[PDB]
């Protein structure tokens, strides 16, 4: 059901409905199933909470109020969307994940709410 | 189920150089062999993988390639060394086997 099969980010961005569904889909082999079901739920909810707080809930593609900081990359969109595998991209900017996520939260709480009320 | 070849036909003077090129629809590492077929004869192997010649093959034949882009350079062309050259994928990325699995070509090299 996975992509990144030579699929560059442009094409890969269109297969999101598949990968988004396979996230949820007292014997030795008894208790283990209960523990495994709980784990699957936990991961699902953590991602949904982030989409919620950033205002991306219900969407596969979410444009936000955070500008791209050039310190995060050394390529043009015309280079990455056409030549890079989603998987390669994620590895290249992995060390900025926590920066972007914090900015995304502020971009909602303040910009779309405290300033809108 | 992998290879395509594009030059179709090339002409050269004796002592000159020509090149031909093949592409793979799927990445196949360095798993591309090359053949020389003279008219009326069974084909001869020139190249094992992208960078390796078979013993007995003149040093004027050489090549390289990886992933999906592969080429063959034939230098110091000898008079009447006319042949059709071909590419073969030696790796099947779908089944995992490593054997001739798809073949194609056509170069009409004339000298």
């Amino acid at each position: 059901f996975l992509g990144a099969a030579g699929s560059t980010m442009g094409a890969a961005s269109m297969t999101l409905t598949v990968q988004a569904r396979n996230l949820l889909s007292l014997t030795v082999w008894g208790i283990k199933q209960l523990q495994a079901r709980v784990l699957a739920v936990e991961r699902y909810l953590r991602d949904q909470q982030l989409l919620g707080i950033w205002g991306c809930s219900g969407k596969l593609i979410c444009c936000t109020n955070v500008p791209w900081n050039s310190s995060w990359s050394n390529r043009n969109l015309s280079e990455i969307w056409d030549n890079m595998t989603w998987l390669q991209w994620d590895k290249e900017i992995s060390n900025y994940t926590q920066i972007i996520y914090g900015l995304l939260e502020e971009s909602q709480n303040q910009q779309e709410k405290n300033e809108q009320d | 189920i992998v290879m395509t070849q594009t030059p179709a036909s090339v002409e050269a003077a004796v002592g000159g150089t020509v090149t031909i090129k093949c592409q793979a629809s799927q990445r196949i590492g360095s798993h591309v062999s090359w053949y020389q077929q003279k008219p009326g004869q069974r084909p001869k192997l020139l190249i094992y993988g992208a960078s390796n010649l078979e013993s007995g093959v003149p040093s004027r034949f050489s090549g390289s390639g990886s992933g999906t882009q592969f080429t063959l350079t034939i230098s110091d062309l000898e008079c009447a060394d006319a042949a059709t050259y071909y590419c073969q994928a030696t790796y099947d990325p779908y089944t995992g086997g490593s054997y001739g699995a798809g073949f194609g070509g056509g170069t009409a090299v004339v000298v």
């Binding site: 996975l2 988004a20 396979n22 996230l23 030795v28 791209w68 969109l77 990455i80 | 196949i28």
Partner: protein, 427 residues
């Protein structure tokens, strides 16, 4: 440009999770998720991924679960503590061949009856490998561990199981012929569940596993380091026919309220030695293939010598074979007797007191099986160790090195569906 968030991106990273079992027998459990009758396999074009069979935690889970099941299944059974009594015991000589002289003994003893104030005099025929001379004998392990008999209704057949990842996770399979134990491979597919793996327990010769498809595979860590085991996977089976020819009977002896011991009974017909027959020509061709492949790492003109075994206990020096619930310890010599520059009959012994995964502190008693046992298995690979000439011989070790030979193709990964990229749009 602006940050755009994408959800459901096809991205994965290495991960360790527990796995689900999918599929009365001791391992089958009969509490696994029914498998998918039409399972999917999804090919990943242009994906190269790195696998390492020696660091694969799926091996550790198979090992831990099978041991836990062994005890969960055999724990609620009759204990044989009352049999740790001085036995009076002499040799069985009534109708035996030469090969069996001293192999069986007729032991008798004073044991507890249904009432605790009464004793009964009973007898059982024991294999030599289960007793210790103190005409007075002790059972093996009465000075080391408690002995519990296995429940007679429990099957030991190696019924296959499948491992399945939880949602949010996936298992990647390396579909690559000629792929060794480690490194990247260009052919990967995604599955949710593994192929069925039979929990076969053996030493020296791997039985009823998967075959290699193009060439005999030699997989080891290092190779040049002779402290490591070499796992050799055949691309063709070698058929081996094992038998226990004596027609046995058994007795049920009450050892107190609610419990009974399964004693061996009398033997019907003459007494002969257990043995295994390996087709000879097939075996000779199979090793020739192993040798041609071994030379790739040792030299084209290097002599490859095969020796029988190192010194050690039965669990090391003989082939360990479990079939019908009977436990065999076969000679395995004559199969490995050459330099490389009909059938082979392997004499085989039988033992009832078993110390297996838990080497000390626990023992299990294999009850007798009435009648005659005939068992046919596929030799699918070897466990070899290495010592101008290289010398190889059958090895052994913990079961993890045998089970990893069926899991070398799999890796567990986690899916990380949420991530970002710059785009020409904005909120």
């Amino acid at each position: 440009l602006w940050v755009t968030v994408y959800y459901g991106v096809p991205v994965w990273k290495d991960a360790e999770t527990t796995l689900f079992c999918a599929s009365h027998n001791v391992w089958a459990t009969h509490a696994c998720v029914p498998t998918d009758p039409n399972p999917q396999e999804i090919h990943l074009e242009n994906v190269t991924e790195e696998f390492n069979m020696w660091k694969n935690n799926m091996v550790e889970q198979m090992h831990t679960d099978i041991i836990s099941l062994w005890d969960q299944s055999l724990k609620p059974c009759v204990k044989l503590t009352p049999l740790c009594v001085t036995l009076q015991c002499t040799n069985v000589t009534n109708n035996i061949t030469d090969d069996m002289r001293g192999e069986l003994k007729n032991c008798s003893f004073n044991m507890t009856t249904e009432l605790r104030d009464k004793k009964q005099k009973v007898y059982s025929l024991f294999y030599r490998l289960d007793v210790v001379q103190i005409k007075e004998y002790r059972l093996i392990n009465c000075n080391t561990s408690a002995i519990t008999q296995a429940c007679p209704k429990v099957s030991f057949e190696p019924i296959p199981i499948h491992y399945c990842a939880p949602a949010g996770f996936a298992i990647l399979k390396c579909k690559d012929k000629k792929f060794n134990g480690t490194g990247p491979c260009p052919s990967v597919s995604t599955v949710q569940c593994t192929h069925g793996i039979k929990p076969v327990v053996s030493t020296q010769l791997l039985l009823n596993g998967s075959l290699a498809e193009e060439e005999v595979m030699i997989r080891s860590e290092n190779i040049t380091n002779n402290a490591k085991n070499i796992l050799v996977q055949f691309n063709t089976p070698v058929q081996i026919n094992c038998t226990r020819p004596n027609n046995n009977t058994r007795k049920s002896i009450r050892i107190g309220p609610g419990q009974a011991f399964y004693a061996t009974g009398d033997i019907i017909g003459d007494i002969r030695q257990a043995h295994c027959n390996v087709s000879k020509a097939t075996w000779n061709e199979t090793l020739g293939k192993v040798v041609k492949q071994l030379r790739k790492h040792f030299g084209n003109n290097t002599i490859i010598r095969f020796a029988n075994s190192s010194g050690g206990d039965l669990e090391v020096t003989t082939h360990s074979f479990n079939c019908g619930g009977e436990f065999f310890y076969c000679n395995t010599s004559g199969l490995f007797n050459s330099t490389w520059i009909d059938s082979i009959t392997l004499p085989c012994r039988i033992k009832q007191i078993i110390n297996m995964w838990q080497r000390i502190g626990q023992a299990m008693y294999a009850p007798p099986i009435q009648g005659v046992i005939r068992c046919v298995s596929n030799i699918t690979g070897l466990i070899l160790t290495r010592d101008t000439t290289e010398t190889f011989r059958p090895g052994g070790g913990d079961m993890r090195d045998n089970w990893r030979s069926e899991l070398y193709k799999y890796k567990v990964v986690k899916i990380e569906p949420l991530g970002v990229a710059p785009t020409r749009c904005k909120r």
